[PDB]
Design a protein around this ligand. Structure first.
Ligand SMILES: CCOC(=O)c1ccc(OCCCC2CCN(c3ccc(C)nn3)CC2)cc1
Ligand SMILES: CCOC(=O)c1ccc(OCCCC2CCN(c3ccc(C)nn3)CC2)cc1
Ligand SMILES: *C(=O)CCCCCCCCCCCCC
Ligand SMILES: *C(=O)CCCCCCCCCCCCC
Ligand SMILES: *C(=O)CCCCCCCCCCCCC
Lengths: 4, 266, 279, 62, 235, 279, 59, 62, 59, 62, 54, 4, 4
């Protein structure tokens, strides 16, 4: 994932 | 320090120098100074021609007269400069050309004279035409060269269907293109209000959807000058003062060399 | 956070600094805030400009075209067994005006197709459910002459096969312009007349027009063979510009559009009557 | 490849930071939905295009 | 086969939606961007730009260059208003078509401070003092300088600095006003009066034009996107 | 855990503390529990108030409107080829009364659209499946004059395109009020009459009414061109307040509603007859 | 394309349901709350308040 | 971005703590379902709005 | 049953799409490749090859 | 078994590297979609099939 | 990256190397670039052959 | 995940 | 996962  | 001012400027390009003692600061369109095509934005692969001082200098166009009846004047770039010295030659000998511009509009009068000129620099200044016929304005008519074109207070439709004039019919309060003049201020501009200033100075970047293009087929910028407030003096109901437009190409470069383009202007 | 600047508490002033006075001749808009000319309190400002971002302003599906196509017996006179549409945002006024607040643009496009149909006549039996083919024909490709000629084989052209009653069809298209940005305005010509020309028709172009076909056409047909009874169908195309970027602001269109160019013809009088000293 | 971001919560239930999850199913970026998280900028290039930008408490013309 | 259950809203089409969809032209070599001058990131940037107000919409002046010109003179009746205008940025005929009014007509609700800038286009030898004002809603709209004085105002002195700005501070009951005309969300009145008078010397024109401009302060914001009444097409 | 307080074991009392006596004049409700006036045992209380939370009380889809629209041949007299509805919870009584137990509210709203249709006459052939357009028109936007005029282009207004037979359409709307809360009651006016007015119509307003359009309208049409045979359709709108917050409790409506305001006209007698000493 | 199988209840509408649905007005700048006096968290709070009984319902 | 919570189990099968999973698919918080986990409060602002709130075993009027 | 909501584009067929679909002949023993001379990886390779121009298209 | 790759982003929103996720649902590789990430090669076998390939600034015939 | 080769800046030439002359009889296509026969500037080439893969 |  |  890429939690921004 | 010393005594420097917003009002007093000197502009020097090539062998030409302009002095002005009554300016109202100067505008750089969209906050962008003219620059050359960078390698990472380049498209024609051939080594460009950069004429520098021979073309990037101040060409003064023919003076127009501002009177009580004047509805407005317009010019297109590069078209107005097509016959100006070596710039014109470079323009017509190459398929491609890009150039920025310093625009200096001049109009002096007296402490007792009155009036205000709106000076606008419009990207892609598409103008409206003559007829029932849409998109019909002819090349020779769309391109007045140094002479420029004029504005009108109202739309007179070119009626002669048999032999159509194929001209623009630019109505002043519609900025000659179907929008309202008051909103033209969103375009890069200055105002010459005679009580306040002699001139306008607008620096223009190359603006287009492409890094470079055919200067003969397409005009990038339009210069529109309109009387926001009419000329007036003492009681003399027929006053007339000159407006002089001087323009310099900046960071001019050309690609695609071959024989010269000779457009039919008749 | 994207909230706007908080209003600052500002008190009385007796000074040589005069924010209220300026000179519009310079070309600049005076950057004043209420605290520059009146006494203000402190306001912790929570409002935001989220709905006026370029993406938000254009993030909506707009009707750009109604393509009418018929399904009926192939007779020998001009019919609508298939139809073609030049892709443009200009056959409609609403989206055209929004995009035209800007000189140049860049975006991907979402096309959504709503398809409705009905019976033409009182009665000749009924119709089994129809499947519609929407073929994109890029400039250069063979255009259909007949509703079922070889062009509809679509071996390289993109086609959508829509089934009537199904959820409205949808596709996305990339930034397909020949330039680094779509020009909403082109002050120029596709050809220059030269002194050495034979007729002067040779160098004649439409003012402000760029390429002849520009983006190509959508060809629509009903793939079904005809029933005894005729069915008329309409394809409504909704386009949405997504992942948008725009350059050089322009004044909004103030008078009614007269075709693809900036031309005006009538109703050049947008402004109402109102007395100078009447609120 | 899941993408996680915070929603700007307008009306709040009687129940803090709330999230939403995004996953791109297609290879072509054109196929993607809109992020709608967009950066704002200075009006300056439009509101103050001056060579010598002057400060508001000073005379515009000097 | 994953067990799924279709919820309401299934197979609908919402004009306002945000969803992925198949790319019709896969692996297309996109033309890259170049740095074009003049990029806009938000519509409010356009509203922050000063545009000229059609202040004069009288019978023979409207839809003509003169709609932009207000006449000041050394012999005007000093008791009268120079101009009277309602603070309705999207609806009032004078404001509704400015770049501000136009952007606002694509939205339903507005909020924030506005600023009006006036330009004196008279001769340099002409002098004068003018009072420009703003009255928040709720009382009788000002008919005299005396009443106008009591509200938010700027006494403009004519001189080298040609122009004067009056800020209309955001003073409202509701957090956001409507772009349409409506007494519940009304914004008040703007008026102009002579503080002294226009004074010229001999051989000088005794009558001249004043131009006016409007734009939004940095606290201005808009919401609920809508279609504008300012454009349409016939059958 | 959300269970209620356990009952405590309480024994006999002979004391100077008197919980049973009080004075309602103070404005307070006496906080007594059974153990204050009777002998009680220990009860481990497991019951909970989960279903009476504000969210739970309103968490249900209520019918707020029946919009009727027809699809038929455009004749030249008043037809229903399209219809408009002012968005309100007040055209119906059931949800209106629940929301009106409170003075102020805040919530997001879920609209769910059930669409039914039928044939009007014995027979003129049949109809192919219909697609419905529900366009929201915010206060200020151009309203439709005709079922297919330019307004339906919906370039910025939100529209739903519903296909007949599909699962009922659904959207969510944010808290869109001009104030920090929706006022279910407004003891005031949108205008004040002033002594300096010309007619006295100028300052006249409806009592308790705020803005004229308040939230705008939903415009409904059948996108399909007409069949020979007429089809009548009805759109039932169900609204649900979600993520709800409410302020200042009010007494429930006791007599029948008489329009948008608190006015009453008849059946002002809600209470039955019952003898004072009759169980 | 993920293989799915529609279960019973599919495409139904339940008045009592709790599900997500598309926002018709995206990126809307919501007016923030202010602290209004008198907030209610549960209907039983109203039932804990003393109200006056119509004890005498004679003719 | 998956959200996990415990269900309040009413009727139990002959089989402890049971969970359910929530994921928000939309950027606008309005689009979200209801959490239904809600906090309760004091009736006091309604049942006892007194300046000097008095204790129930004492005289209401003193 | 996972709660799902059908988006636009559902049940359509796009000639340009890229999706998985059931294999009609499962567990088939595919004939392996051999190194054939002359493999092409991109159509532009063919355009880089000189071909002879029909320069003379007279009657 | 999720597969994650970078999209080649053509037109960019006013919001970097963007990804997409792929999962194969079928045992037979035939059932799979196309990766479209493909390697290019030398035209040489076609444009220069010479035994003694010569350098362009030298005479083709020597 | 799959972008094509950047054009190199190339200047004037007076030499014994003759890229312009060749012999198609060999069976080979002459591998010339614009910089071999004309003066060229530096172009950072971003175009790609992605849509013409088999 | 956010297990509450 | 196999992030490439
Ligand atoms: C001046 C005209 O309008 C525009 O500037 C303008 C208008 C539309 C726009 O979109 C690009 C047009 C070409 C697209 C449109 C439709 N396309 C497709 C492709 C496949 C299918 C099945 N259906 N449609 C693919 C190509 C880009 C620019
Ligand atoms: C006193 C009247 O009733 C209310 O107080 C009241 C009633 C309803 C309520 O909801 C807000 C009303 C406006 C909403 C309602 C419907 N909306 C939309 C938007 C798009 C579409 C396609 N369909 N509907 C968007 C705006 C909020 C308050
Ligand atoms: C990154 O995305 C890795 C985690 C993936 C979680 C499961 C995703 C389920 C949906 C996959 C769609 C595949 C589309 C071909
Ligand atoms: C947090 O949510 C990361 C874990 C994601 C697990 C797979 C989620 C599958 C559903 C994704 C929906 C994407 C909606 C655009
Ligand atoms: C690798 O794929 C492990 C991670 C899986 C994430 C959830 C995938 C959901 C879709 C599974 C499809 C099963 C097909 C039989």
């Amino acid at each position: 994932i890429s939690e921004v | 320090a010393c005594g420097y001012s917003d009002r007093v400027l000197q502009l020097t390009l090539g062998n030409s120098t302009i002095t002005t003692q009554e300016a109202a600061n100067s505008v750089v369109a969209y906050g962008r100074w003219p620059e050359f095509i960078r390698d990472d934005e380049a498209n024609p692969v051939d080594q460009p021609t950069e004429p520098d001082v021979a073309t990037c200098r101040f060409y003064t166009l023919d003076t127009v007269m501002w009177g009580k009846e004047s509805k407005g004047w317009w010019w297109k770039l590069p078209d107005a400069l097509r016959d100006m010295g070596l710039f014109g030659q470079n323009m017509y000998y190459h398929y491609l050309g890009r150039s920025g511009y310093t625009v200096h509009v001049q109009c002096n009068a007296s402490k007792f004279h009155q009036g205000a000129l709106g000076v606008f620099a419009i990207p892609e200044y598409c103008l409206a035409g003559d007829s029932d016929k849409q998109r019909y304005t002819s090349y020779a008519n769309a391109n007045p060269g140094e002479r420029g074109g004029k504005f009108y207070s109202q739309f007179n439709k070119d009626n002669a269907v048999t032999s159509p004039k194929r001209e623009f019919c630019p109505v002043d309060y519609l900025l000659g293109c179907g929008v309202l003049l008051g909103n033209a201020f969103v375009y890069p501009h200055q105002i010459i209000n005679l009580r306040t200033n002699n001139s306008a100075t607008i620096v223009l970047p190359y603006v287009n959807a492409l890094a470079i293009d055919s200067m003969v087929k397409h005009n990038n910028w339009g210069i529109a000058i309109l009387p926001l407030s009419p000329l007036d003096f003492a009681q003399d109901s027929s006053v007339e003062i000159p407006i002089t437009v001087t323009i310099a190409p900046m960071c001019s470069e050309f690609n695609g060399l071959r024989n010269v383009t000779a457009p039919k202007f008749q | 956070q994207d909230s706007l600047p908080d209003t600052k508490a500002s008190g009385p002033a007796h000074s040589k600094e005069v924010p209220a006075l300026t000179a519009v001749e310079t070309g600049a808009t005076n950057p004043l805030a209420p605290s520059d000319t009146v006494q203000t309190r402190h306001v912790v400002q929570r409002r935001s400009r989220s709905e006026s971002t370029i993406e938000s302003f254009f993030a909506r599906g707009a009707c750009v075209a109604i393509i009418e196509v018929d399904n009926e017996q192939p007779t020998t006179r001009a019919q609508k067994l298939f139809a073609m549409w030049r892709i443009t945002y200009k056959d409609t006024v609403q989206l055209r005006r929004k995009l035209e607040l800007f000189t140049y643009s860049r975006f991907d496009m979402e096309l959504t197709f709503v398809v409705t149909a009905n019976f033409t006549n009182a009665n000749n039996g009924h119709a089994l459910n129809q499947v519609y083919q929407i073929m994109y024909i890029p400039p250069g490709a063979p255009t259909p002459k007949s509703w079922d000629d070889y062009t509809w084989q679509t071996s390289s052209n993109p086609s959508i096969f829509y089934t009537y009653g199904a959820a409205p069809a949808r596709i996305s298209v990339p930034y397909v312009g020949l330039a680094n940005a779509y020009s909403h305005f082109y002050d120029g010509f596709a050809k220059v007349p030269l002194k050495t020309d034979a007729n002067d028709q040779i160098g004649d172009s439409l003012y402000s027009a760029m390429t002849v076909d520009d983006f190509g056409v959508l060809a629509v047909r009903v793939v079904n063979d005809h029933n005894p009874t005729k069915v008329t169908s309409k394809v409504r195309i909704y386009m949405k510009p997504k992942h948008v970027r725009v350059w050089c602001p322009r004044p909004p269109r103030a008078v009614p559009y007269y075709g693809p160019g900036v031309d005006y013809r009538n109703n050049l009088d947008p402004l109402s009557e109102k007395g100078l000293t009447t609120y | 490849g899941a993408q996680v971001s915070s929603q700007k919560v307008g009306a709040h239930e009687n129940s803090s930071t709330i999230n939403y999850t995004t996953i791109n199913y297609y290879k072509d970026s054109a196929s993607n939905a809109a992020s709608k998280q967009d950066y704002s900028q200075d009006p300056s290039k439009f509101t103050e295009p001056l060579k010598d930008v002057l400060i508001k408490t000073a005379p515009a013309l000097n | 086969g994953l067990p799924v259950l279709n919820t309401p809203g299934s197979n609908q089409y919402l004009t306002s939606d945000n969803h992925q969809s198949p790319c019709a032209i896969p692996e297309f070599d996109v033309t890259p961007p170049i740095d074009i001058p003049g990029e806009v990131k938000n519509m409010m940037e356009l509203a922050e730009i000063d545009t000229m107000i059609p202040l004069n919409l009288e019978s023979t002046k409207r839809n003509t260059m003169d709609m932009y010109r207000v006449t000041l003179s050394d012999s005007a009746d000093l008791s009268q208003p120079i101009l009277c205008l309602s603070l309705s940025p999207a609806f009032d005929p004078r404001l509704s078509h400015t770049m501000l009014g136009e952007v606002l007509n694509y939205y339903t609700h507005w909020a924030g401070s506005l600023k009006f800038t006036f330009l004196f286009c008279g001769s340099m030898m002409a002098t004068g003092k003018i009072l420009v004002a703003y009255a928040p809603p709720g009382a009788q709209p000002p008919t005299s300088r005396k009443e106008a004085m009591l509200g938010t105002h700027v006494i403009w002195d004519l001189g080298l600095q040609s122009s004067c700005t009056m800020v209309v501070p955001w003073i409202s009951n509701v957090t956001y006003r409507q772009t349409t005309q409506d007494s519940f969300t009304e914004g008040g009145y703007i008026s102009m009066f002579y503080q002294t008078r226009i004074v010229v010397p001999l051989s000088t024109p005794k009558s001249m034009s004043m131009l006016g401009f409007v734009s939004a302060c940095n606290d201005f914001s808009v919401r609920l996107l809508r279609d504008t009444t300012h454009i349409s097409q016939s059958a």
